[PDB]
Amino acid sequence: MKIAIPKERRPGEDRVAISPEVVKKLVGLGFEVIVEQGAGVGASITDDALTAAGATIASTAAQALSQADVVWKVQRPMTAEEGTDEVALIKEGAVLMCHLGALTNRPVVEALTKRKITAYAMELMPRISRAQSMDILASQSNLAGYRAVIDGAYEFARAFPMMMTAAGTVPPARVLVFGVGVAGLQAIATAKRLGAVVMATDVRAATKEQVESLGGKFITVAGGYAKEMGEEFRKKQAEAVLKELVKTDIAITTALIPGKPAPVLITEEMVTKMKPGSVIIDLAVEAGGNCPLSEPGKIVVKHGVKIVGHTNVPSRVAADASPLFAKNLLNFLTPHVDKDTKTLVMKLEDETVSGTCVTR
Amino acid sequence: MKIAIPKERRPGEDRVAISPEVVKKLVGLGFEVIVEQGAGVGASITDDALTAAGATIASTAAQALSQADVVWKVQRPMTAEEGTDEVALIKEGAVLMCHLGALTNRPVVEALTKRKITAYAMELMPRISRAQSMDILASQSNLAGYRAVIDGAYEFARAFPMMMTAAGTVPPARVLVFGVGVAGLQAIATAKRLGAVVMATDVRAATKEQVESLGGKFITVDDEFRKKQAEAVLKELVKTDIAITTALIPGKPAPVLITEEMVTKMKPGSVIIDLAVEAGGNCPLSEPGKIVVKHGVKIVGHTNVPSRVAADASPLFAKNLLNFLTPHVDKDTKTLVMKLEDETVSGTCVTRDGAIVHPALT
Amino acid sequence: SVKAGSAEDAAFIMKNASKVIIVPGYGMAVAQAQHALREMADVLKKEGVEVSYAIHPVAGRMPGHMNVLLAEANVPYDEVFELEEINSSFQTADVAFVIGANDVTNPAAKTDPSSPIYGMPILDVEKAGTVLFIKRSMASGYAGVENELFFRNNTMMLFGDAKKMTEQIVQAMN
Ligand SMILES: NC(=O)C1=CN([C@@H]2O[C@H](COP(=O)(O)OP(=O)(O)OC[C@H]3O[C@@H](n4cnc5c(N)ncnc54)[C@H](OP(=O)(O)O)[C@@H]3O)[C@@H](O)[C@H]2O)C=CC1
Ligand SMILES: NC(=O)C1=CN([C@@H]2O[C@H](COP(=O)(O)OP(=O)(O)OC[C@H]3O[C@@H](n4cnc5c(N)ncnc54)[C@H](O)[C@@H]3O)[C@@H](O)[C@H]2O)C=CC1
Ligand SMILES: NC(=O)C1=CN([C@@H]2O[C@H](COP(=O)(O)OP(=O)(O)OC[C@H]3O[C@@H](n4cnc5c(N)ncnc54)[C@H](O)[C@@H]3O)[C@@H](O)[C@H]2O)C=CC1
The missing domain is CATH 3.40.50.720 (NAD(P)-binding Rossmann-like Domain)
Known part of the structure; x- marks a missing residue:
């Protein structure tokens, strides 16, 4: 598989859905981890520290997302109306994972449905004892x-x-x-x-x-x-x-x-x-x-x-916020990765995935 | 006997040389405490609260200082050369007490000297143990x-x-x-x-x-x-x-x-x-x-x-002044009389009665 | 001249007391004896003994020194009092527990100008029945002058480290 993480071009956002620890793990699972040339200067994570863990450094947002079977973001992608069509950069058939803010931002979800992107809304996690691992609302609100x-x-x-x-x-x-x-x-x-x-x-x-x-x-x-x-x-x-x-x-x-x-x-x-x-x-x-x-x-x-x-x-608190957010993502991903047939097999029954999934 | 306390006209300065508690101690000492309107706004100290403690309010710095025998201030007064002549507002023959920065700034010392004002450089408080309640350097720098x-x-x-x-x-x-x-x-x-x-x-x-x-x-x-x-x-x-x-x-x-x-x-x-x-x-x-x-x-x-931290700084700064001042209020007669054998008065007193005193520059 | 005492001696004194008040100072901080000091005050609170902390405004080597360390050890503000509203209460107190303090208890502050401590306010520990000092040696305080309380009073020199001797006391009290 091939996973990609872009820079956040939303003004203010210094957070990122990646860390050097999380890069090591995804490689361990079977993901080619691509990151952008400066995604996380605000999070205070250098590109070479990501490369030490085993990540490629892309030139731009597009070259990062273009061959990406999975895409991890912090914010929802920008619609075309919002300025730059980030939804279109993501390969049609890819799996998106971020705080979509789904129930508010319907025009974003429309675009993801339009080009076959299986998008996973992390704010809609079920409040169950085991889910604290994957809950972004808690991790971010503690900070x-x-x-x-x-x-x-x-x-x-x-x-x-x-x-x-x-x-x-x-x-x-x-x-x-x-x-x-x-x-x-x-x-x-x-x-x-x-x-x-x-x-x-x-x-x-x-x-x-x-x-x-x-x-x-x-x-x-x-x-x-x-x-x-x-x-x-x-x-x-x-x-x-x-x-x-x-x-x-x-x-x-x-x-x-x-x-x-x-x-x-x-x-x-x-x-x-x-x-x-x-x-x-x-x-x-x-x-x-x-x-x-x-x-x-x-x-x-x-x-x-x-x-x-x-x-x-x-x-x-972007430098503490980001690695924990990346860990929430990995915790959601890890129980569905099938190594030996190195692919992402998202169970359609796991209550985690039921409350998370919207489009596919 | 009047003690005036203006607003700090210098830029980026929210502190004031007074608190309600210190007002009550000064009133008790036999002063009446005039203060320039809105001089504690920056330190979260309303003039309502000052008048509550027994303090007159003035309209301008002039109205405050014009008749004041003692004058408390946080940072040094300004000269004409700087823009606004605050030294001019001080009554001739009066007592000034502030952070003069006297040794660096000779013209402010000479300005006060020209006007017969007796000034006390609070930053020159001797490092003795008794004077730790009067040491403005310690109280402000801690914050x-x-x-x-x-x-x-x-x-x-x-x-x-x-x-x-x-x-x-x-x-x-x-x-x-x-x-x-x-x-x-x-x-x-x-x-x-x-x-x-x-x-x-x-x-x-x-x-x-x-x-x-x-x-x-x-x-x-290690070695x-x-x-x-x-x-x-x-x-x-x-x-x-x-x-x-x-x-x-x-x-x-x-x-x-x-x-x-x-x-x-x-x-x-x-x-x-x-x-x-x-x-x-x-x-x-x-x-x-x-x-x-x-x-x-x-x-x-x-x-x-x-x-x-102007709001915590200000009452501490004011108490440093009050701790330095209180010892020298006699009031068997309505008079401040500064003992010279007192080492605090020795160290801090820069100019007096129209002539410069401190051995740092004479 | 000098009297001395063990942690067993300080246990016999303070556990059989109605009111003790604690006087923290630079030695407490130096030895980081603050969690043991609450613990000794917890044992005395459980026994039914009155407990309060007397913070001289200039104890330690900075403002708020004893406060931050007593707060680290989770002493509640309720029991902490400043000099200006406490040292009348010493005469209504059986034991004056002085830990790491020496200059701030010295009565030469209100006696002679032959000392540099002269003029400074001080905690009236002598007013209490018996005065328990805890320092390592006979050495001077910050001032470089000796306390007359050492050669005096019901004063006891509990010689040793403030964390360890407070710990040894707590064990003797159970
Ligand atoms: N708080 C502040 O902002 C400042 C305070 N000061 C000065 O500090 C003094 C405050 O007095 P205070 O702190 O109460 O007492 P001291 O200043 O006298 O503190 C030193 C004493 O603590 C003892 N001591 C050192 N280590 C230990 C230890 N491990 N266990 C037990 N005791 C120890 C020493 O005795 P021994 O060697 O025998 O162990 C010594 O007698 C004042 O004189 C004040 O002027 C000065 C500047 C700032
Ligand atoms: N998966 C899980 O097991 C999770 C459980 N939780 C639990 O839920 C609780 C709260 O979670 P949060 O996300 O922080 O809640 P929240 O973000 O939805 O709201 C914050 C807090 O404000 C309080 N609140 C809301 N309206 C109020 C009002 N009008 N007046 C006074 N208080 C009001 C609530 O009690 C809540 O605790 C936590 O104590 C936690 O134990 C939280 C996250 C995940
Ligand atoms: N009235 C009194 O008894 C007072 C006593 N003091 C004592 O004096 C001490 C110093 O306080 P201040 O005068 O405010 O300090 P300061 O503002 O003069 O200097 C700060 C510190 O920096 C250190 N320093 C200076 N140049 C340095 C260099 N090149 N490299 C490394 N360190 C350098 C000094 O040793 C000092 O410890 C305090 O520890 C305090 O105990 C402080 C205020 C009042």
């Missing part, structure tokens, strides 16, 4: 939870930890984490590392044990995700939190209802009650936002409060 | 050290701590600190706590113990020309991800500790934080106020790092 705190620290004009000083005591920062999943838990862990006093809240009840284990305090207002509660709950979610939210210095917002847009936890009216120079990091900004003041791509200064809402947070 | 790590962590492409995911493990960031004074030593702590693997180096032999006390590792050889120890620095700097430079020999320019020939033998995606950028840089590729990139390695050289 998004860490960096929430660093972006928070970067924008915050005070220091996080308590320091007893000759010139006096700087008090510890007060962090509040909204939503305690893969990202939310890391944010607690990371804020804790920097000496903050972390508190958190969630819809899910078993969360209280998770937060307390990291060393935070809990504030207490069906398949591995929060069911939407309604404004009955949203109203009760105001005043129970307000006590802490006022004196709170930094606010990470994680919450995501998988079907719907993101639930409004911090209103514009709540923002006003906080201290001046407080920071809010909105991670759900690309999906409506838990804070409706938050605008994608940019930091919104209003009410004496910074409101950060970067798009593509995992790319801001 | 600047903490910042380096946050700035390093921002520009860096991986996370600091090791993370064992279901989807595989990512190794921790490795950090190297050049210069283990107040700044770097807090950077070691801020790095180690974030989960990074931290190393450091220093000309002083007593440093190894300090570095080791935070869980850092001191670069030193002369000792300065083939740069091979040990090379050996680590090669696999270093973030390199925070601190070394800052005083008065003289910043000693070069990372040459370009070393920057090139270094991982692309690396970061260099140069806190010494304004003194010259310990890496001479570093440019004041901007993030240069060469040989793959980002070279960060922000000016006025303490102002990046």
Whole structure:
């Protein structure tokens, strides 16, 4: 077989679906691994390090994809309308694997159907115990939870930890984490590392044990995700939190209802009650936002409060993000590779493949 | 007795020489505390909160300073020659207290002297043990050290701590600190706590113990020309991800500790934080106020790092002044009287009553 | 002149106490004795003894030195107090556990200008009933001046390394 991985020409994207470790493995399986001349300068992976593992270096995106039986990407390919017809570069008959963002981006899937490409959407992984290996949403959102705190620290004009000083005591920062999943838990862990006093809240009840284990305090207002509660709950979610939210210095917002847009936890009216120079990091900004003041791509200064809402947070940790994403891909691929008849035999029954597959 | 505190008109300066807590201590000492409107906005300190502590508010710097007997400021006042004559606003015969940078900047000293203003260079606070509560160099630089790590962590492409995911493990960031004074030593702590693997180096032999006390590792050889120890620095700097430079020999320019020939033998995606950028840089590729990139390695050289933590910096800066000031407020009579036998007053006092005093330049 | 004591001696003193307060300093950090120090404070908390940490603002070799290491060892902020709101509480405390500290306890700060420690605020450890120092030797502190508490008081010189002698104490307490 012959697998190919291109550079990401989507502006911002420094991530890649490859690493030198993953190149070794695919060769071991029986894949000629082709990569592009600089795919992963942002991920901080040199071409020669990929070649040491046993990968060819292509000149361009087209020469990489042209004879590619399998194609691994991070982002969905660009449609012709979007600028450059990347879907057309991929050989008709090839197997694509990336975060297609399928349910949103139907025009992309149309093109893949049009030229016989068997495309596999990684965001649509079933939430089953063994699938954590292959889940990109978790791997990337864990790194998004860490960096929430660093972006928070970067924008915050005070220091996080308590320091007893000759010139006096700087008090510890007060962090509040909204939503305690893969990202939310890391944010607690990371804020804790920097000496903050972390508190958190969630819809899910078993969360209280998770937060307390990291060393935070809990504030207490069906398949591995929060069911939407309604404004009955949203109203009760105001005043129970307000006590802490006022004196709170930094606010990470994680919450995501998988079907719907993101639930409004911090209103514009709540923002006003906080201290001046407080920071809010909105991670759900690309999906409506838990804070409706938050605008994608940019930091919104209003009410004496910074409101950060970067798009593509995992790319801001592109060098950690990328090898883990590549490992999610390999974990999905490995149980279907048939060496001895060195081919990719994607089982049509494995629940992994059922929820992943769309076109073929 | 009036004490005024203006807004810091210099560019890239969010700090202020006051806090509500210090206002209450000054009021208690028998002053009334005038402050220029919106002088603590940058430090997240509203004038509402200052008036709450018992402080008058002024409209302009003129209205603030015009009648003030004592004047607190963060960074040195500006002369006409620079653009805006802040020294002119200060009342004749008054007391000034700030970071003058007096020894480098003679014209600001002569300007204040022309106007009979008694100035105190807070950076010339003697290194005695009692004066550690008044040492502005320590308090600000400690925060600047903490910042380096946050700035390093921002520009860096991986996370600091090791993370064992279901989807595989990512190794921790490795950090190297050049210069283990107040700044770097807090950077070691801020790095180690974030989960990074931290190393450091220093000309002083007593440093190894300090570095080791935070869980850092001191670069030193196993076993002369000792300065083939740069091979040990090379050996680590090669696999270093973030390199925070601190070394800052005083008065003289910043000693070069990372040459370009070393920057090139270094991982692309690396970061260099140069806190010494304004003194010259310990890496001479570093440019004041901007993030240069060469040989793959980002070279960060922000000016006025303490102002990046302006909100924590400001109350500490103000307390340094208050700790220096409080001892000399008699108030059996409404008077500040500065004892000369006090060594803090000896060391910091540059000009007095229309004549220059300090033996550094007379 | 000098009194001395073993980890068995320090166990007899502190386990039979109502209130001890801990005074960390540069030696704790040097010896990285911070996880053992929480553990000794955990044993005393389980026994029913009152425990608090007294952080002199200038203890260690940097600001926030004792804080970061006590935080590494997962001491909660609740029990940590600064000099300015603690050293009245020493007289209502049976044992003053001083670990790696020497200059910050020296009462010559509030006595004579023949010392460079003069003028500086210091933790009033002498106010406690008995004062447990832990340093390796008779050697000076950062100042290069000797504490008068050494030749004084109910002061005990628990001579050795701070991690190991705190560890040996924890074993003696069970
Ligand atoms: N925090 C800061 O920002 C700075 C503080 N300082 C100075 O530091 C001093 C602070 O005092 P403090 O840190 O409390 O005490 P010391 O400064 O006296 O710390 C040194 C003491 O620790 C002991 N020690 C060294 N290693 C060990 C070990 N392995 N186990 C047990 N003890 C050990 C030494 O005794 P022995 O050799 O016998 O083991 C010595 O007496 C002040 O004088 C201050 O001026 C100065 C600059 C900055
Ligand atoms: N295959 C598997 O076994 C997987 C299981 N999981 C589990 O699912 C949980 C959450 O997963 P994530 O992907 O992080 O969830 P998510 O990304 O869909 O949402 C983030 C978190 O926000 C919370 N949340 C949503 N709406 C909220 C609201 N309105 N108010 C307060 N909190 C709200 C949820 O509880 C969720 O934990 C984790 O604890 C994890 O154990 C996660 C990934 C994979
Ligand atoms: N009032 C007081 O008692 C104070 C005491 N201090 C003490 O002084 C020490 C130094 O603090 P600062 O003056 O802020 O440091 P600094 O800003 O003068 O220099 C930083 C560090 O870089 C080192 N260095 C300088 N040039 C170098 C070179 N070419 N190569 C390698 N290393 C080089 C120095 O040894 C120093 O350790 C601290 O450890 C602290 O304990 C610091 C502030 C106040």
